[PDB]
Amino acid sequence: DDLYRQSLEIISRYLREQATGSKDPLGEAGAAGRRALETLRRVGDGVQRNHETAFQGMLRKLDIKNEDDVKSLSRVMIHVFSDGVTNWGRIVTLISFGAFVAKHLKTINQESCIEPLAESITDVLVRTKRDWLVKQRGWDGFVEFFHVEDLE
Ligand SMILES: Cc1ccccc1-c1cccc2c(CCCOc3cccc4c3CCCC4)c(C(=O)O)[nH]c12
Ligand SMILES: Cc1ccccc1-c1cccc2c(CCCOc3cccc4c3CCCC4)c(C(=O)O)[nH]c12
Numbered sequence: 001d002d003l004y005r006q007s008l009e010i011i012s013r014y015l016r017e018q019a020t021g022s023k024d025p026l027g028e029a030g031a032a033g034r035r036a037l038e039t040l041r042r043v044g045d046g047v048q049r050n051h052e053t054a055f056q057g058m059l060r061k062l063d064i065k066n067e068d069d070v071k072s073l074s075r076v077m078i079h080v081f082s083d084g085v086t087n088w089g090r091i092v093t094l095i096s097f098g099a100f101v102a103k104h105l106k107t108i109n110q111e112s113c114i115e116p117l118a119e120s121i122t123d124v125l126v127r128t129k130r131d132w133l134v135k136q137r138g139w140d141g142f143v144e145f146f147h148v149e150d151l152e
Contacts, residue, residue, distance in 0.1 A: 003130070003138045008122040010036045010139065011095055014044065015118045018099035019106045032139035039146045040095060047096035055100045064101065070113040070120070073101075077124040086132045088145045094121065 009026065010033060017023045027033035048055065064070060081094065098121050102114045126133070137144070 001126075003133055004122060004126050006033060006139055007125060007133075008119065009033060010040060011098065011121050011125075012115060012118040013037060014040050014095060015099050015102040015114055015121075019102040019111065019114055032143060035143040036139040039143055040092065043092050043146055044096040044099060047093055048100050051093075051096075055097060058097065059101060059104055062101075064104065064110075065108070066110060067113055067116075070105070070110070070117050073117065074120045074124055077121070078128065081124055081128040086129055088136075088142055091125070091129075091142070092146075094125065 013024060013026055014037060026037050062069070062073070062076065064073070077094075081090075084090070098117060102117060105111060105113050105117065136142070
């Protein structure tokens with residue numbers, strides 16, 4: 001599965017470099033993956049700053065203490081992503097909260113749960129939104145959407 005293997009890479013690398021504080025060198029320059037991670041860094045870091053309150057509140061509410069609580073995250077994700085509208089905004093918000101949660105997993109000494117968490121995000125993202133992802137040219141459409149430079 002090309003669109004899954006790709007999503008899992010962008011989602012895995014973002015959550016990892018966010019939790020660590022330093023960038024790992026993803027794919028190849030100019031490709032969908034490279035541009036998608038650079039975009040996700042730009043728009044997603046903003047989402048975590050702008051929505052820090054709501055993110056602190058959802059994290060407390062979710063009360064993720066261990067590995068079990070990480071695995072059980074697929075349930076609330078399925079609930080939320082099977083509802084409302086589909087747009088890249090929601091997709092970037094979903095990945096930004098996963099980077100926020102991944103930072104917490106580090107502070108609570110559950111670093112190992114991060115890649116499993118990333119896996120769970122890709123699984124929910126594809127099972128609830130793949131027809132829309134295909135129709136949108138996947139990570140190429142994502143990149144194109146947040147490309148605001150050639151409008152004039
Ligand atoms: C504030 C909001 C505005 C717009 C877009 C998104 C969000 C939003 C963000 C994050 C989570 C939620 C939730 C779920 C609340 C926690 O629910 C659970 C917790 C643990 C297990 C389970 C669940 C529910 C399913 C069963 C298993 C709802 C919601 O219910 O409307 N909205 C959310
Ligand atoms: C911004 C915002 C404003 C006001 C009040 C609340 C919020 C809010 C808080 C937290 C997440 C979201 C999301 C992402 C979709 C739900 O994602 C999750 C739900 C449960 C667990 C996990 C996720 C993502 C991966 C980590 C594990 C949306 C959104 O799509 O509009 N809004 C959220």
